[PDB]
Write a protein that binds this DNA or RNA. Structure first.
Ligand SMILES: [Mg+2]
Ligand SMILES: [Mg+2]
Ligand SMILES: [Mg+2]
Ligand SMILES: [Mg+2]
Ligand SMILES: [Mg+2]
Ligand SMILES: [Mg+2]
Ligand SMILES: [Mg+2]
Ligand SMILES: [Mg+2]
Ligand SMILES: [Mg+2]
Ligand SMILES: [Mg+2]
Ligand SMILES: [Mg+2]
Ligand SMILES: [Mg+2]
Ligand SMILES: [Mg+2]
Ligand SMILES: [Mg+2]
Ligand SMILES: [Mg+2]
Ligand SMILES: [Mg+2]
Ligand SMILES: [Mg+2]
Ligand SMILES: [Mg+2]
Ligand SMILES: [Mg+2]
Ligand SMILES: [Mg+2]
Ligand SMILES: [Mg+2]
Ligand SMILES: [Mg+2]
Ligand SMILES: [Mg+2]
Lengths: 110, 117, 103, 141, 55, 48
RNA sequence: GGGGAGUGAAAUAGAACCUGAAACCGUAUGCGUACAAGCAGUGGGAGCCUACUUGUUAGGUGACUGCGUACCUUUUGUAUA
RNA sequence: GGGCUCAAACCACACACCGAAGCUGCGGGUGUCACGUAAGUGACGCGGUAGAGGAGCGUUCUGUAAGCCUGUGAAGGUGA
């Protein structure tokens, strides 16, 4: 079976979060968890929570074993942006986009 | 009274983009870029219906030249011989014989050689 | 065994049992046509070359069906001159089946 | 309907040409046309249907008129003022194979296929060539 | 100085062909079986067998 | 005789010209006004 | 914020909630792509992949190759830098 | 451009061939005249900006319509 966890509106850019997602794609969950625990990226703290929530769904709703699970699918989708104004030097107003993303991790034994 | 253009405009744009399938970058995604590519591809396609007939005839003539020179004749001498002896086999069929039916092509070349002298 | 026939302003190399698509012939579906303009009949090492027609040679075919080729789009565009006209085309053909080649 | 030569089933022969005493351009046209496969009825413009040509005795090629000292080979190094010129006579004394190689390369198409056809030309200085296992057939023009 | 032409999405992603993150060197303690950075004190507080920070 | 079976005679009624509605209409992009000058302008009229 | 459970005819109707287009951004698969020069197509065309109709078939890709300097406007004239 | 010199240059003559969307062949459409009181035949046409002339498609609303279709699935959306 395949179980997923999703974090919607993760306050980080999809471009930034996809660097971490590319590291754990296709890995066994135990290895992916150790990679995320020692990564210097902010997306790894967020990604690790989604990954271990997917592992918990696989162990409660489906009754699996962490040692049998591997990261089958992980993708980051762009979420809602937040629009902000930053003043510039001569009365110029610049629009700031505060990006968010949707992080979906799917674990599977298969 | 008031006429919205959304449904009709979407149908128009989708017909163009469907024709721009397989094109690179904006040429398959962006309507006002895809529209130019679909028109230009149409200009090329019209012009290349003419060019295809030229390209194939140049290919037949080159193969007939190669086949006839294997038989001791140049292309120009073979065509003149095929007119002296009233042989109306065209170059598309002649180029097919020179590749696939070499004994048949040799017989025709000998018939042209005899007609010349 | 193959023959070279003339059909609709063009020439075709044909064998027995071959399916062809030629220019539209005014012959009903299923009727048998007999091509008399045969330019070359080859039985294998027995090449007969017409001058211009192989004397006493006949290729017999059967009209399988009529139809139209895939649509061709014709576009005429003159840039910067406010001119563009489009036109479709489907060429009629007749599908024939070569049922016999005689020397 | 019209035949096309499949690259997978192309028959390619090996020929050896002796360049001794031959006019450079008139020998280069035969080589270029046989590297293209224009001598074969199976000739296809997008397929390399041509033969392998081995040229021996490259330094013994000849040019008519006063071209031995007057024919000049130019190239540029990409650096300002980097135009360099060499004689036919001094190029024959230095890199004799380059003379025949240059005359054939300008006679081939300037595209990937033309560079493929060039790879079938083997020019050598001596009277011997290393491709004896291919048993080239002597091709005197 | 600015682009005369918008950079294509292929060209944007080609520059990013060097952006992939590398993985750290991970080691396992033998006194505890715990994963830690190589040459670093473990998150529990062990380095080469002995406890050093003592929490 | 029916309300969906009634016509005027051929030539009795015609469509009006609709300029500036594309190349194919024959009245696109200038409306038959030519290129420049007063006569091409909005409100451009020569006094009687 | 999700995964189940449940409600509901329907939850990818879950409250930023009918439908849910495009630009734009991803993941998966197939093919192509690291000796190659340009409006990126078009003509020819190999191979590979998929599906049946099992090769005169359909779909996807497309090596290699001929030809080929966007569009609008304005102009005597525009690839026009 | 490669290269070319009893030329792959120049002069003269000759016989071939290549070469366009020109001409012919084959199939199709259309305009105008004429014959047709018909279906259709015949001849000649059919590049085109500004511009004139002719013939249409589609969209929203009204009538036809208290009709007809539609939860056994409308409009819209997305493929074939
Ligand atoms: Mg070229
Ligand atoms: Mg006009
Ligand atoms: Mg104007
Ligand atoms: Mg003016
Ligand atoms: Mg005026
Ligand atoms: Mg229920
Ligand atoms: Mg509703
Ligand atoms: Mg909705
Ligand atoms: Mg390569
Ligand atoms: Mg480039
Ligand atoms: Mg094709
Ligand atoms: Mg080109
Ligand atoms: Mg000016
Ligand atoms: Mg120009
Ligand atoms: Mg410009
Ligand atoms: Mg420029
Ligand atoms: Mg001719
Ligand atoms: Mg022509
Ligand atoms: Mg004509
Ligand atoms: Mg006709
Ligand atoms: Mg004309
Ligand atoms: Mg006209
Ligand atoms: Mg409506």
């Amino acid at each position: 079976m395949e179980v997923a966890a999703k974090l919607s509106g993760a306050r980080i850019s999809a471009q930034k979060a996809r660097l971490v997602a590319d590291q754990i794609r296709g890995k066994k969950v135990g290895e992916a968890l150790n990679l995320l625990a020692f990564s210097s990226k902010k997306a790894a703290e967020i990604m690790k929570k989604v990954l271990e929530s997917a592992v918990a769904n696989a162990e409660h709703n489906e009754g699996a074993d962490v040692d049998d699970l591997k990261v089958s699918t992980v993708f980051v989708n762009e979420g809602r942006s937040l629009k902000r104004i930053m003043p510039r030097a001569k009365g110029r107003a610049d629009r700031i986009v505060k990006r968010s993303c949707h992080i979906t991790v799917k674990v599977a034994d298969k | 009274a008031r006429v919205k253009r959304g449904v009709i405009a979407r149908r128009r744009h989708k017909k163009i983009l469907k024709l721009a399938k397989g094109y690179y970058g904006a040429r398959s995604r962006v309507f006002r870029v895809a529209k130019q590519a679909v028109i230009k591809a149409g200009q090329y396609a019209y012009r290349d219906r003419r060019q295809r007939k030229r390209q194939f005839r140049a290919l037949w003539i080159a193969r007939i030249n190669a086949g006839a020179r294997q038989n001791g004749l140049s292309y120009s001498r073979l065509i003149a011989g095929l007119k002296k002896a009233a042989i109306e086999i065209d170059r598309k069929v002649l180029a097919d014989l020179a590749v696939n039916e070499k004994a048949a092509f040799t017989a025709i070349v000998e018939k042209a050689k005899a007609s010349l002298a | 065994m193959y023959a070279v026939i003339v059909t609709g302003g063009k020439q075709h190399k044909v064998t027995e049992g071959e399916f062809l698509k030629v220019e539209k012939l005014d012959v009903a579906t299923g009727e048998a046509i007999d091509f008399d303009r045969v330019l070359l009949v080859a039985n294998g090492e027995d090449v007969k070359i017409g001058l211009p027609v192989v004397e006493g040679a006949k290729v017999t075919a059967e009209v399988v069906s009529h139809g139209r080729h895939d649509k061709v789009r014709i576009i005429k565009f003159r840039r910067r001159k406010h001119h563009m006209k489009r036109q479709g085309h489907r060429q009629w053909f007749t599908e024939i089946k070569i049922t016999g080649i005689q020397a | 309907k019209t035949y096309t030569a499949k690259p997978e089933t192309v028959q390619r022969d090996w020929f050896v040409v002796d360049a001794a005493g031959q006019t450079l351009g008139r020998l280069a046209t035969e080589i270029a046309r046989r590297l293209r496969g224009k001598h074969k009825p199976e000739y296809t413009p997008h397929v390399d249907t041509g033969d392998y040509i081995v040229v021996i005795n490259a330094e013994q090629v000849r040019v008519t008129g006063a071209k031995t000292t007057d024919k000049m080979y130019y190239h540029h190094s990409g650096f300002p003022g980097g135009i360099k010129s060499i004689n036919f006579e001094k190029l024959i004394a230095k890199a004799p194979e380059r003379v025949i190689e240059t005359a054939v390369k300008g006679m081939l198409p300037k595209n990937p296929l033309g560079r493929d056809m060039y790879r079938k030309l083997k020019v050598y200085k001596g009277a011997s060539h290393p491709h004896t296992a291919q048993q080239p057939q002597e091709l005197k023009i | 100085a600015v682009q005369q032409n918008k950079k294509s999405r292929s060209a944007r992603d080609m520059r990013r062909s060097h952006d992939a993150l590398e993985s750290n060197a991970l080691s396992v303690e033998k006194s505890t079986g715990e994963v830690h950075l190589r040459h670093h004190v473990s998150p529990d507080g062990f380095y080469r067998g002995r406890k050093v920070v003592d929490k | 005789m029916q309300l969906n079976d009634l016509r005027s005679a051929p030539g009795a009624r015609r469509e009006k010209h609709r300029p500036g509605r594309g190349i194919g209409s024959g009245l696109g992009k200038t409306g038959g006004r030519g290129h420049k000058g007063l006569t091409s302008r909005s409100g451009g009229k020569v006094a009687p």
